[PDB]
Design a protein around this ligand. Structure first.
Ligand code: WD5
Ligand code: CL
Ligand code: CL
Ligand code: CL
Ligand code: CL
Ligand code: CL
Lengths: 202, 199, 202, 201, 201
């Protein structure tokens, strides 16, 4: 197969509306935030404007092809793929996607989608101008798929991609798995809670 | 049936333009606002910027499937479904939808659509910096469907951000049904009274 | 007929690009503005930011159906209908439509379209902080259809739907029929001139 | 023919991607800006926010019909027509189109497209608060079509449509045709340079 | 062939989803920024708002046609072409494209795409109000295609820069880099554009 054939096959048989569950197990989605910038912070309103790369991976076996005498990977527009319906629970703006909306598909059906996103959050900005800094928690999970359909799991240097030119610096990033069960319903919705410990540079 | 078959069937036979009335009874739409944040308040202009989850439920029997050896529920893009034409009467900005535009469809044809919306409203901000607080009333109803086509009923502060400059004292919901001088028909709305104050 | 059949028939046959002229007479469009709010006024720049319901009615006989044992009216997306190409001649922002873009179609082919619009205008803001108030004139008519193709005519209490919470109050609204000729072309374009007499409550 | 037939024919045979050149001669595009308002001016940054009607005309013979016992003109969505790829070279915002995106098509294939546009420009705001005023020059031409494919010409009262309520007033509007060879490409690109001489009241 | 036939053929066969690699060599993409304006600078936040023409060229042999008794070039909507998935690594706003989204396709399959973009960047604004000025570095490369799939090269400063900017350009250098990230084995090529500029005195 060449790239043309693989991309034709994916475009022609793409069920972007269909979660690729295998044998009634959840789709395992990995999410890791790489912080790139902290642009605007307001300690009065507890609001932050952040840029991050959202490293997102999952398997869709319907995409897989025999890689013998074929490309190992192709770039696919996300409009031709099922993508997890991830939302930031404490976002106060729509995600501004700064990058081309393409994912990488490996011949085994692994998908890697890593958009650069600028987004505003409601989180704890208290202590931002102190030595110990602020801890801003960002929660990202499936909007409509509970734990039997989508599982979310966290997956380098926290500041490896962070802009040296930000007014802020990163002290620590932790990414941990949470679940919310709401009063209305019995099902749990999984999220990654990303704790961004940062401060204003002196 | 698997998810692929159910979602194919819905996509292929979706009449998103067709209100799913049964036996000439109105479609019963439930609306409950879960307040998440109060972001900007202006007591001079009487304007508020609010984030809420708009819990919206109704039945569309045309979506229903036999759930024996099948999923009980699927996630469906709202572009493939009829959705009530709800509007906030006192909104002064278009709703900014912060979440994926998917609904949950249950095998009995129940639809649950719960977008996170940021929107600006014209309401009473007077008293926001006092102990008793402000009461901001938000009215939501069908823009074009009268009471014989759509009924709206209330089904709320539990998921409010601890980091807001504001706090919720109380949320009350009433149903209103208004017949205007021009027309014979009644228009239903849910009136949500948000009593909040600066911390 | 049921709603499903009527909406199918309209979607299949509507011709949204085709002005429904009868025997080469103009399409009679009625326009009435119901003011809902006055949000921002600037007496220096002579600019106002207003919210209004634009009550718009006309007949399209191609939409009509036999109402015996059928609904008298349906809700139709405006993308499935011909709609008059109305513009505010003194608008300085695009109309922000706040409401679902649906019209009501009666079985005789009468259409009622009433969007809630927020829009900014260039008009006379002088006297806004006085007892007599400002008179801000808004002109609305067809962008491309002259008087032989579209006629515009004005169609309750002026303040009936006006927000009690506005910094402003309405003293009077008058709506009258005008015509504009541009220097380039011989034809007249009909408009409704809406005079909004309002003042600061102070 | 009635309007329904003409609009069906245009919609069914519309090649909006295809420049309607005749025998490898350029498409003659006429462009005239009618200024409606000057909303924000900044003499520090040399930026202006303007509203104008962009009167745009050209011929597309593929649209033409026999007008005997037929309408002489129809309103057509620009999504069903080829439109010149005009750009303002010194625009610093996207054109905000305020009006329905319809053009007039005459039975001979003449197209008239006149959107109301709000747009921000980088131009000379110096002297805006003086008697002689500022001269803000706006250059509009085809982004991708050189002079053998598109020619641009100014059309053959400057304040006739200008808002009486603007903080500003128009002293003069002049339009001149330029034909410029840029470093990237060997071909010449035509533009209309519109000089807006205006001042604060 | 006429333009209508060429544009039909391209629309029917272009494969916009398919990188036009030849014999498993990378697609050679050339990128050069022509700075048009510097609109807003903030030395406190280290943010700049810039307008530039992004001159972008590559070959797609699947677009080629016999140019004998045919146009040498056509204007094609980029939605009908494969375009490199270029991103500015230090952009903090989405690119605001100010120009019609058309590329030029030559009969040999060479593509020229040159949008005017307004975009905000995180870069070194320190020294902007001094004689030596600030040096703001902008890195542009393929978001998803590593060096075996896409190579990025500069073509070899103030020619199109607005005389009305509050700022002036002292120097522009454009040089080729390769970045390997810790997670993954492949290198991604980028053009690093160093914009040395200052406030006019
Ligand atoms: O459906 C969700 C929900 C949240 C809160 C309440 Cl009170 C009810 C339902 C849970 C899944 N994510 C979207 C919202
Ligand atoms: Cl690829
Ligand atoms: Cl599902
Ligand atoms: Cl209906
Ligand atoms: Cl017409
Ligand atoms: Cl061409």
């Amino acid at each position: 197969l060449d790239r043309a054939d693989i991309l034709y096959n994916i475009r022609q048989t793409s069920r972007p509306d269909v979660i690729p569950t295998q044998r009634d197990r959840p789709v395992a989605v990995s999410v890791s935030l790489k912080f790139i910038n902290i642009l605007e912070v307001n300690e009065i309103t507890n609001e932050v404007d952040v840029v991050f790369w959202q490293q997102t991976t999952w398997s869709d076996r319907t995409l897989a092809w025999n890689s013998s005498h074929s490309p190992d990977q192709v770039s696919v527009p996300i409009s031709s793929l099922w993508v997890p319906d991830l939302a930031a629970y404490n976002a106060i703006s729509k995600p501004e996607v700064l990058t081309p909306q393409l994912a990488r598909v490996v011949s085994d059906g692994e998908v890697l989608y890593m958009p650069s996103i600028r987004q505003r959050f409601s989180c704890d900005v208290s202590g931002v101008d102190t030595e110990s800094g602020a801890t801003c928690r960002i929660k990202i999970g499936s909007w409509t798929h509970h734990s039997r359909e989508i599982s979310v799991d966290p997956t380098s240097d926290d500041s490896e991609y962070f802009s040296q030119y930000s007014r802020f610096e990163i002290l620590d990033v932790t990414q941990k798995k949470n679940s919310v069960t709401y009063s209305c319903c019995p099902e749990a919705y999984e999220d990654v809670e990303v704790s961004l410990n940062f401060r204003k540079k002196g």
